[PDB]
Motif scaffolding. Structure first.
Motif, PDB file in Angstrom:
ATOM      1  N   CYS A  52       4.094   1.592   9.447  1.00 16.59           N
ATOM      2  CA  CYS A  52       3.924   0.516   8.478  1.00 16.59           C
ATOM      3  C   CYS A  52       5.263  -0.019   7.996  1.00 16.59           C
ATOM      4  N   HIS A  77       0.813  -1.208   0.000  1.00 17.12           N
ATOM      5  CA  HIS A  77       0.000   0.000   0.000  1.00 17.12           C
ATOM      6  C   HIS A  77       0.847   1.258   0.000  1.00 17.12           C
ATOM      7  N   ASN A 131       1.125   6.466  13.325  1.00 20.51           N
ATOM      8  CA  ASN A 131       1.192   6.749  11.899  1.00 20.51           C
ATOM      9  C   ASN A 131       2.643   6.780  11.442  1.00 20.51           C
ATOM     10  N   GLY A 132       2.920   6.178  10.289  1.00 23.80           N
ATOM     11  CA  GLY A 132       4.295   6.016   9.864  1.00 23.80           C
ATOM     12  C   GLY A 132       4.925   4.664  10.185  1.00 23.80           C
ATOM     13  N   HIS A 145       4.061  -5.074   9.822  1.00 25.29           N
ATOM     14  CA  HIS A 145       2.883  -4.291  10.185  1.00 25.29           C
ATOM     15  C   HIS A 145       2.299  -3.592   8.953  1.00 25.29           C
ATOM     16  N   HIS A 146       0.975  -3.730   8.747  1.00 25.22           N
ATOM     17  CA  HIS A 146       0.274  -3.077   7.635  1.00 25.22           C
ATOM     18  C   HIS A 146      -0.710  -1.994   8.052  1.00 25.22           C
ATOM     19  N   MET A 147      -1.438  -2.143   9.158  1.00 25.50           N
ATOM     20  CA  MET A 147      -2.508  -1.189   9.403  1.00 25.50           C
ATOM     21  C   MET A 147      -3.038  -1.302  10.827  1.00 25.50           C
ATOM     22  N   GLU A 148      -3.752  -0.264  11.229  1.00 27.45           N
ATOM     23  CA  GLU A 148      -4.520  -0.263  12.460  1.00 27.45           C
ATOM     24  C   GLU A 148      -5.991  -0.413  12.112  1.00 27.45           C
ATOM     25  N   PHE A 208       1.872   1.251  17.922  1.00 32.43           N
ATOM     26  CA  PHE A 208       2.245   1.719  16.601  1.00 32.43           C
ATOM     27  C   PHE A 208       1.543   3.044  16.333  1.00 32.43           C
TER      28      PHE A 208
HETATM   29  C1  LIG Z   1       1.070   2.861   6.547  1.00 33.53           C
HETATM   30  C2  LIG Z   1       0.936   4.235   7.187  1.00 33.53           C
HETATM   31  C3  LIG Z   1       2.387   4.480   7.598  1.00 33.53           C
HETATM   32  O1  LIG Z   1       0.491   5.219   6.277  1.00 33.53           O
HETATM   33  C4  LIG Z   1       0.057   4.282   8.443  1.00 33.53           C
HETATM   34  O2  LIG Z   1       0.561   4.743   9.415  1.00 33.53           O
HETATM   35  N1  LIG Z   1      -1.344   3.821   8.519  1.00 33.53           N
HETATM   36  C5  LIG Z   1      -2.073   3.301   7.353  1.00 33.53           C
HETATM   37  C6  LIG Z   1      -2.124   1.943   7.009  1.00 33.53           C
HETATM   38  C7  LIG Z   1      -2.875   1.540   5.904  1.00 33.53           C
HETATM   39  C8  LIG Z   1      -3.548   2.481   5.146  1.00 33.53           C
HETATM   40  C9  LIG Z   1      -4.374   2.088   3.907  1.00 33.53           C
HETATM   41  C10 LIG Z   1      -5.810   2.530   4.183  1.00 33.53           C
HETATM   42  C11 LIG Z   1      -4.341   0.584   3.641  1.00 33.53           C
HETATM   43  C12 LIG Z   1      -3.784   2.807   2.691  1.00 33.53           C
HETATM   44  C13 LIG Z   1      -3.493   3.823   5.490  1.00 33.53           C
HETATM   45  C14 LIG Z   1      -2.761   4.231   6.591  1.00 33.53           C
HETATM   46  C15 LIG Z   1      -2.147   3.941   9.757  1.00 33.53           C
HETATM   47  C16 LIG Z   1      -3.505   3.213   9.605  1.00 33.53           C
HETATM   48  O3  LIG Z   1      -3.570   2.016   9.482  1.00 33.53           O
HETATM   49  N2  LIG Z   1      -4.754   3.947   9.695  1.00 33.53           N
HETATM   50  C17 LIG Z   1      -5.993   3.178   9.566  1.00 33.53           C
HETATM   51  C18 LIG Z   1      -6.999   3.698  10.599  1.00 33.53           C
HETATM   52  C19 LIG Z   1      -8.456   3.620  10.162  1.00 33.53           C
HETATM   53  C20 LIG Z   1      -8.720   2.581   9.073  1.00 33.53           C
HETATM   54  C21 LIG Z   1      -7.903   2.861   7.816  1.00 33.53           C
HETATM   55  C22 LIG Z   1      -6.424   3.173   8.091  1.00 33.53           C
HETATM   56  C23 LIG Z   1      -1.605   3.414  11.102  1.00 33.53           C
HETATM   57  C24 LIG Z   1      -1.837   4.172  12.265  1.00 33.53           C
HETATM   58  C25 LIG Z   1      -1.394   3.685  13.502  1.00 33.53           C
HETATM   59  C26 LIG Z   1      -0.784   2.437  13.518  1.00 33.53           C
HETATM   60  N3  LIG Z   1      -0.604   1.746  12.394  1.00 33.53           N
HETATM   61  C27 LIG Z   1      -0.998   2.169  11.202  1.00 33.53           C
END
Ligand SMILES: *C[C@@](C)(O)C(=O)N(c1ccc(C(C)(C)C)cc1)[C@@H](C(=O)NC1CCCCC1)c1cccnc1
Ligand SMILES: *C[C@@](C)(O)C(=O)N(c1ccc(C(C)(C)C)cc1)[C@@H](C(=O)NC1CCCCC1)c1cccnc1
Lengths: 305, 305
Positions: free
Chosen positions: B145, B41, B142-143, B163-166, B140
């Motif tokens: 991933c 992503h 933002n940032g 790690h991919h997402m929250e 974790f």
């Molecule tokens: C990957 C990164 C660095 O941008 C990020 O921090 N986070 C993230 C992960 C995945 C996505 C998509 C939606 C798959 C592109 C966007 C952003 C966030 C995160 O996962 N936010 C989610 C919260 C609500 C649901 C959708 C996205 C993150 C924040 C804290 C810890 N880990 C990841």
């Protein structure tokens, strides 16, 4: 989101750990530039562990009696000295992996990371706090002497603790890197007891602020209170008294959450008087006091090194 | 003595973390030999986070659109591919600091260390478990991933998590290093909910054994019980059912303490029915389930790496 007992990355310290043998005792040393640092009780033998005279025991030792290994390598001792309760062994090779570093003597309530080592090889890393009675509630087995505690500030390692011994109560005691013990403990096999271990109030408040940031809101109340009136409640429950310096140290977290320090004190007071009622905060069923205000911001704002 | 949430030393993984930028998103990659691994992503932009077609988005990208930095250095991408939910970027330089390593897909209940990274720089290390619902309760921001989870077996690093997402509930989801998610989660901004999160029974037993080794004896009882009758109590309290494989995995700890597994099950049963009565075990006021039987022996027997 989330909140965990987080240690610093240990890479910079891993490269510094060596194995030190004097006669038949083997413990861990810290190799920085051309000096190896380790607890002086490496030179003890079985029968004089009750009351050794380290100065006397040191006259019967020369450079070649101290064997230092860094991995499979062998280092040459070309000098030795005793500084308070640590030995400084001067060697022929400067550690190529020496990081930027300094020696610091920390205050009670402060926290650090411990790299537990055995035979000069790192086993694991965890966080702990210097308790108000100058012990630490660590995780150490036989052989762990000379393992070190540190904080990291970007590229610079601040060494604050070297492990020396376990007390019969199961908690741990050690020195700064200049070899002065934390607390009134001595490096001998005598009856040594820790005093009353009180709770680090400013750390509990910091941990409530972290809970708030993570959405855990149930303990917040309508009440407020005063510094003097909170400290009345703190003393009955064996909490460290809160000072205005502690209030000021909490400023950043107060600013981020919009919650004044004294309102959070009011919330802690109710939790001390009525308990938590089978509820939990940040996954814990008791008030956690080994996170400093700085630990909290670093975890909930993302400081890197 | 003592017992702490202990992570593995992170040195070997620190040297592997790099920063990956595609257009304007920056996340962490893992550099092993001449391949960089990161979540796919990274190629998303703002408006197609709802339902991206990664294959389609990948046709509009060439080698030179992917910027990989290892510290201040810059690496040259000479090839790229998509394997399930991770990108593999082929670069011109093999990592000089590549450790011996393998990719493993772990089972629920198993634990690992997480090196939290931001901008390709490590921030901290902690332990966590793969929960029975295939989330992890991490820490974790933002940032983060592309940060990875690992176990260490002497010199060999076993990577098990990226790690991919929250999730909107605050827990975390990710893949193995072949890019297959743990659980039913997808890398899109949709409503994704975790299922029921049950307690890892074999880990709670292991943690009671650790308590015993450390002298914490008050919960042990006169009763015994049967596998079937314990599992009756386990199901009412949302505990994973205990199998004979779990009993066998607990053998080493049983042997060390002299306490049979079924007698410990009897003790856990009473703690589930009557609670802990304001008492604590190993410093905790609830039953801890993120230490495996192997975590316990390593901490209370001193395995090194
Ligand atoms: C990957 C990164 C660095 O941008 C990020 O921090 N986070 C993230 C992960 C995945 C996505 C998509 C939606 C798959 C592109 C966007 C952003 C966030 C995160 O996962 N936010 C989610 C919260 C609500 C649901 C959708 C996205 C993150 C924040 C804290 C810890 N880990 C990841
Ligand atoms: C230093 C080492 C590696 O031998 C050791 O593990 N321990 C130790 C420390 C100091 C001493 C003397 C008495 C100062 C020479 C001996 C041994 C032990 C330890 O501290 N045992 C104490 C228990 C009862 C009181 C006297 C010694 C150790 C064990 C577990 C964790 N840390 C240290």
């Amino acid at each position: 989101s989330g909140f965990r007992k987080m240690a610093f990355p240990s890479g910079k310290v891993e490269g510094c750990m060596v194995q030190v043998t004097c006669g038949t005792t083997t413990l861990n040393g810290l190799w920085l530039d051309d000096v190896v640092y380790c607890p002086r009780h490496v030179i003890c033998t079985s029968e004089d562990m009750l009351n050794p005279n380290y100065e006397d025991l040191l006259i019967r030792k020369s450079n070649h009696n101290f064997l230092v290994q860094a991995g499979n390598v062998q280092l040459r001792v070309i000098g030795h000295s005793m500084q308070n309760c640590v030995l400084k062994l001067k060697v022929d090779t400067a550690n190529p992996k020496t990081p930027k570093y300094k020696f610091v003597r920390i205050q009670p309530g402060q926290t650090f990371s411990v790299l537990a080592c055995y035979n000069g090889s790192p086993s694991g890393v965890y966080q702990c706090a210097m308790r108000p009675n100058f012990t630490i509630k660590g995780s150490f087995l036989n052989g762990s002497c000379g393992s070190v505690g540190f904080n990291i500030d970007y590229d610079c390692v601040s060494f604050c603790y070297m492990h020396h011994m376990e007390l019969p109560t199961g908690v741990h005691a050690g020195t700064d890197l200049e070899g002065n013990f934390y607390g009134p403990f001595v490096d001998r096999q005598t009856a040594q007891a820790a005093g009353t271990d009180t709770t680090i109030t400013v750390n509990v408040l910091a941990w409530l602020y972290a809970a708030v940031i993570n959405g855990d809101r149930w303990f917040l109340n309508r009440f407020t209170t005063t510094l003097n009136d909170f400290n009345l409640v703190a003393m009955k429950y064996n909490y460290e008294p809160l000072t205005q310096d502690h209030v000021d140290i909490l400023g950043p977290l107060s600013a981020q959450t919009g919650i004044a320090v004294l309102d959070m004190c009011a919330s802690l007071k109710e939790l001390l008087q009525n308990g938590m009622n089978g509820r939990t905060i940040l996954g814990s069923a008791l008030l956690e006091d080994e996170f400093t205000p700085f630990d909290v911001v670093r975890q909930c704002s993302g400081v890197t090194f």
